[model samples]
Target chain A: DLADRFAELERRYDARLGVYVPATGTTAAIEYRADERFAFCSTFKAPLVAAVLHQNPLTHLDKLITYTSDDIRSISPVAQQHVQTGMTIGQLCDAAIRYSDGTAANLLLADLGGPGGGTAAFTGYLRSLGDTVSRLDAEEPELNRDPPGDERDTTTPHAIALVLQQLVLGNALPPDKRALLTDWMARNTTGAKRIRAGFPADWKVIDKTGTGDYGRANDIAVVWSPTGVPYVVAVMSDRAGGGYDAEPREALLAEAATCVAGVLA
Target chain B: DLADRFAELERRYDARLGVYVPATGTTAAIEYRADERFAFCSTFKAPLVAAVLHQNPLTHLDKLITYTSDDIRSISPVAQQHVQTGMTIGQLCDAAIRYSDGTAANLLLADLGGPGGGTAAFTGYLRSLGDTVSRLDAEEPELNRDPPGDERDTTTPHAIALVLQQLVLGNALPPDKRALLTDWMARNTTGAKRIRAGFPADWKVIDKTGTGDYGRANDIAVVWSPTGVPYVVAVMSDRAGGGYDAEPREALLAEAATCVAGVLA
Candidate 1:
């Protein structure tokens, strides 16, 4: 129902986006994208968090990771505003989710594998979850240093919908860890004006937001109606053919989400 | 210049707007309207602020206006969330500007000759400035109490633009008091996602926002470019003429402001 309309909607803004909705009252997703690639941007952290917790137990998540002077990286205002000498991995993941903390993310990346064995585990897990397109190919600092050759991180609306699905249906993490991920996303502050802003306030929206230098912004969420009916929503864009202030892009996302929510309901 | 393109743009959205800039590049202004009235929802407090200051001195603004149990007014979330028993007139005006506090505005109105001589002063100042379109005829509780004839508070993109012009240009309030008004507007949290969101973050914005039943929304501002050049912008809509989410209305305003900012710059 939403696929054709959103495919064209994306083209109008010179940016492309897709909404992969499951069947009528169903959870089986089907996607059609005019420009198919949904640049993952900061959204990769969703899987990254899953990988980190999968590798390290919840009790170990609070271990402190020190921030060296060079950890003061750029592009993330939240990261630049860092004040602590060191913070637990749990705290850093919260920052990564809530504020899209670049420094926190880089720290987590370095901790996870830093372009080494840990990263291999991370990518292997993503492939295992049916999302080989979304990769942790570069360290955060290394990507910042040399710049990406083509797309740094990328996925399709269809592929991400699958990743989220497998994350839910598969027995990768126990309920407690799953609760931790969703609870962290539920309290996220970065996507306030994007996805949840369009939804009714009482609805529970656990979501992640992503932005990139070359006109890419993405928001994906698991939402529940006021009465607790559940739905998953993913909106991704890659081209800002429109001007700044992001009116066209956000408006389209809001419209698509509203439509999908009603259909699924 | 932007004036001609935006004239057509307004017609497309079934809205009217104006940008008034004084000569000599001093950023002075006088924005008289053209065939229009903008509904003054929360923006009614703006004129009310000027009226209260004109009748009472700068010190008089500090006088307390008590909040009765029955004073829990409609349309103002600030009033509903009140913790203070009584608030000073200056404090109420601050709410009027910063939070668009409905209760604070009505209390100030009741204090400033509600259904009394002070109203004459309110309309008088508006009349002198060519803006009876923006009125204080309906108190918040009363409006929630009964049916309005059609619309009680109204003005044009041009008329309120003129009102702000005279408020800044005319000898109505002394410079320091005017600073109080503009300063309150500068720090306002209500209009956060409206006009200012359309521009760069570094630009200095002083403005007010209002919303009415049946999809009326208005935002008017005095903006200083990063280089210190100033521009006056006002955008008002009686109908969206499109689907909800208010994208059409905001897009028109944001585009118009961007265009005007460039022209004036």
Candidate 2:
């Protein structure tokens, strides 16, 4: 019955979904494409923050990272509004991962060495943790130019899920780093209204949300039940004509989450 | 005579060519699809520099804008290698426009605001100068991630020509800013052996070059003669089968430059 509900959810949403239950150590994945890729958006920043912290565990989180007027100009209001501060590295990570601050992410990116630096360090940390699907590549070069033609960033679902699994299992980073990462995830801001909309209100879900023009939506999360079992879930989609109110589109996700919760419950 | 030589060169190289001579304000364009747009590649950095400088003229150029490991991780090798030191806003403009340094350009982007900030500022500046054919949109967001997707940056020859005209006549940026821009152009490092190859050696040519995977080749330039005539030229192409080091390809551009120079001269 739970499996039927999960499959129905996939059909109705017209999207890809994956789940990993840590208590049972089981994984379920459904998708239209075998090697599916979508834009990770700010979700990729989690690994990026982890990588930066790994490089200098003792680095101060609150050192002021300056952003010029240009840094504050972004489509994401969160990025545009994040002010430069002498906050510790941990604060920057929280602002970036929890708040999805674009300016904070950019500052962290500069600290890691811009796009390439961020990718190298972040991916290196992911690999060190044994994640195969998750990798960081080129930075967005056309971001600063006038665009009739500009490129978009991309990532794979399988890779990202693996990163989450590793992080959850306490193997992705050093123990302290992993603890901090998990703590930040528990406090992420956007999940409540988006990915978790269909699930029961009492569910404890740690997740990240990413949205952009053309109805692009991405969410990766871990759900914990009253029984103390934990599961990792990811939904990546680009509903070209879909509206911004994502609850309807994410209905399948909510159903799947409930169905999975029932099975584990 | 130079016009004829350029035609011969075009026949030999089989590539598109556009030229603008600014001193006398004449243009010579030759291509089958004049309305077609091609990938802009690193050439986009020029206007990006102008946008950053315009917003925060007081932003110090010498402040150390550290490139985080992630930044290095996300950029091209060419960019990572050249972008070192706490560059002044002015020096960043020079490095990006003159040398086509990806790191320098991206760091300047951080100064302008990341991808969205940089593009909006650049487009706004272009519109202020009365360019109607060109539209600066958001950086296609997907290019920043994995699997090395399509090149998203693009520009039309006509649009580039218009920008060049504005820059040469000191109509784009303020007077001092324009002087700095032109000086940067004079120091441009690419297009010497290709776009200017067929022209008389004594002719002074300022240009920018951009190349990427899949044989994406581009050049946007301004040419000046001893006779005090100047013109703007832009050539963009997808020479797919043409190997990266093919001599005939470059010779084709040389022929076009020489022809355009002669016609305008």
lDDT of 2 by residue, B30-84 (tens): 4433455655666677677666656656446555565643554222223443244
> Can you write out model 2's per-residue Cα lDDT over A221-264, one digit (the tens) per residue?
87766666666666665543343323335554556556655665
Q: All models: lDDT?
A: 0.64, 0.58
Model 1 CAPRI rating: incorrect
Question: What are the candidates' individual DockQ scores?
Answer: 0.02, 0.01
Give the runs in model 1 whose Cα sits over 4 Å from its true position. Answer: A22-30, A81-84, A114-119, A141-152, A168-170, A240-248, B1-265
- How far does residue A47 in candidate 2 sit from its true spot (Å)? 1.4
Residue-level lDDT tens digits of model 1 in B1-265: 3457767876777754544444435544433244355556676678778877877777887676656434543434344323233577888888888877767776777766635534545666688667656564566533321122344555566667667766755667888888888888889886766778777888998888876554556777877779876666776654534322234256666776666666555
Per-residue lDDT of model 1, residues A1-265, tens digit only = 5566766676666666666644425455545561266666677777778777877878878697766656565333334333444678997788777766666777777777645735566677788776657655565534322222354456666676666654543466778788777788888765766668767778888888776544556787777778876666777765543333333245666766766665555
Q: What's the lDDT for residue B35 in model 2?
A: 51
